[PDB]
């Protein structure tokens, strides 16, 4: 009853040695970016994100300190994934960040910044697309603010 997969689909990779937390994180990346963990009564859960609200919001009289960056140090805009026995490849390709670096800096061609990685147990190309998409997504620009309050 604690399991509510948002886009339930078959796995086409064998997860047979991954850390359990890393496998669950890949399933959440494949299905609706879900929250998972250990609750009260020590039950596991896996379910849709953003389900409850806290009515006592941090109003302007109720913060004491804040520190709110946009983190982009580790971002990149191309990943090439080798899969099969290293015998086929796929490039996952963010065109927006390449063009924005080009126009910003005045580069003669799109501002590619790459990672190469290899997953030699992946055989379904559409899983190697996931691997590369997941690598870009977890590195992307985000706000990651700290706010301090009391209750």
């Amino acid at each position: 009853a604690n399991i509510t997969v948002g886009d339930d689909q078959e796995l086409t990779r064998s997860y047979q040695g991954d850390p359990v937390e890393n496998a669950l994180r890949d399933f959440a990346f494949k299905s609706t970016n879900e929250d998972f963990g250990v609750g009260d009564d020590l039950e596991f859960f896996f379910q849709p994100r953003e389900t409850v609200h806290i009515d006592r919001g941090v109003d302007n009289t109720q913060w004491f300190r804040y520190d709110i960056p946009e983190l982009g140090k580790e971002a990149i805009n191309e990943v090439e994934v080798w899969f099969d026995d290293g015998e086929e490849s796929v490039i996952v390709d963010d065109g927006t960040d390449k063009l924005d670096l080009q126009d910003s800096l005045g580069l003669p061609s799109p501002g590619t910044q790459r990672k190469e990685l290899q997953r030699p147990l992946v055989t379904d190309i559409s899983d190697a697309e996931d691997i590369g998409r997941k690598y870009l997504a977890f590195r992307n620009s985000t706000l990651s603010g700290t706010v301090t309050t009391y209750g």
Binding site: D7, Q9, E10, T32, P48, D93, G95, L99, T112, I125
Partner: protein, 401 residues
């Protein structure tokens, strides 16, 4: 923006192409591990049953001065009569597959002395495989045969030895010579009407003999006409193709193919579960709805003999059905939930799509029929000669407040 500025290529995301073949390496992938002896040819033109019997009208054999024989119940009205020592009849072929030696056979339709009682010559067969020569004596000095089909390889008729059961490799230049090695009782001729070296197909058909796979008919209508077989090709290859795999349920599937013919027992069979096959008969395109949605599609194909004729042997099955290109499509979700209020769209461009192969790609858009729903600029790339291109289009729904 109403439309893409010079659109190069367009593909559906209601259907996705889960399998295809159009080239030797693709066909060798989706056929799976066929044995080197299986009577199927993969080629730049398509996949086709192998020629598996040769069958030569006796007047079209290579000649060494043997006696011409004319009778109405001989095929084409005429046969060659083995008579004078060393008067070889010779036949050449190249097999499109490995023939296992324990089921090679040499059917000939043959008689002695216009149906007379008195023995023909003793006859020697030599089979030559690119210079490797195998020789045996199936017909003795004291036998006469009534007009019928006889295998000179696996049986003897007063002779001393059979074919030596050697395998014959694919693409080998194979030559037979059939020779009277000592003289006949009179100037009679041992009349051979038609020679048919073949694979007996007991590997493919559960019977112990070629009669289970070929027509050995023995009556042309007595008027200089022709026999119905042996037909040049196997009756039916029921090919089982490798599973078309999916992450998602398939509710219905559609196929398309190119073929030289679709007559007779030609069909395509599709299943969601590997056993409940639904059949489309005698068509190059078709659609199947499955009993319930399930994730992988299995396929079977039937390729057969075709053609009927009145001017040469064999009168039946002198052509075989070939498939040039194959495509299988399935009703699969390619627009997917991805987060709270977010969808991901995952269209695919097949690796050799004309109008975009060898082309620089610079923009993309989510679309529905003619109307463009979204447009994007892309960093330039060249879609090179073998590359699958696919989308990962996020569409987000959100408020201002």
């Amino acid at each position: 923006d109403t439309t893409l500025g010079n659109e190069l290529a367009n593909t559906s995301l209601e259907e996705i192409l889960i399998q295809s073949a159009s080239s030797v390496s693709a066909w060798n992938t989706i056929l799976g591990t066929l044995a080197s002896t299986y009577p199927l040819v993969v080629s730049s033109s398509g996949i086709r049953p192998a020629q598996t019997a040769w069958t030569t009208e006796s007047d079209n054999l290579a000649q060494s001065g043997t006696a011409l024989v004319t009778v109405g119940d001989y095929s084409n009205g005429e046969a060659e009569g083995l008579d004078s020592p060393g008067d070889t009849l010779e036949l050449s072929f190249t097999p499109e597959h490995d023939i296992p030696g324990e089921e090679f056979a040499l059917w000939c339709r043959i008689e002695t002395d216009l149906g007379g009682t008195d023995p023909g010559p003793e006859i020697t067969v030599t089979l030559d495989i690119d210079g490797d020569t195998y020789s045996w004596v199936p017909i003795g000095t004291n036998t006469a045969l009534g007009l019928n089909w006889y295998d000179l390889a696996n049986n003897t008729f007063g002779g001393s030895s059979t074919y030596p059961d050697t395998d014959i490799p694919e693409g080998s230049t194979v030559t037979l010579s059939i020779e009277a090695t000592s003289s006949s009782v009179s100037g009679q001729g041992h009349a051979v009407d038609v020679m048919a070296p073949l694979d007996a197909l007991t590997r493919v058909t559960g019977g112990s003999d070629a009669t289970s796979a070929y027509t050995f008919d023995n009556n042309n209508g007595g008027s200089g006409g022709y026999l119905d077989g042996p037909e040049l090709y196997p009756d039916q290859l029921i090919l089982s193709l490798e599973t078309a795999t999916t992450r998602r349920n398939v509710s219905e599937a559609r196929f398309t193919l190119t073929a030289n013919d679709t007559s007779g027992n030609f069909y395509v069979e599709l299943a969601n579960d590997g056993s409940t096959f639904n059949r489309v008969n005698n068509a190059t395109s078709g659609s199947v709805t499955f009993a319930s949605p399930d994730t992988n599609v299995d396929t079977n194909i039937s390729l057969n003999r075709y053609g009927s004729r009145s001017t040469a042997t064999p009168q039946t099955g002198f052509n075989a059905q070939e498939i040039d290109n194959w495509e299988l499509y399935a009703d699969i979700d390619a627009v997917l939930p991805d987060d709270i209020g977010v969808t991901l769209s995952r269209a695919i461009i097949p690796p050799n799509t004309s109008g975009i192969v060898g082309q620089t790609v610079r923009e993309a858009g989510l679309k529905s029929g003619s109307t463009l729903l979204t447009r994007h600029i892309l960093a330039e790339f060249l879609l090179d000669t073998d590359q699958r291109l696919a989308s990962s289009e996020s569409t987000r729904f959100t408020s201002d407040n």
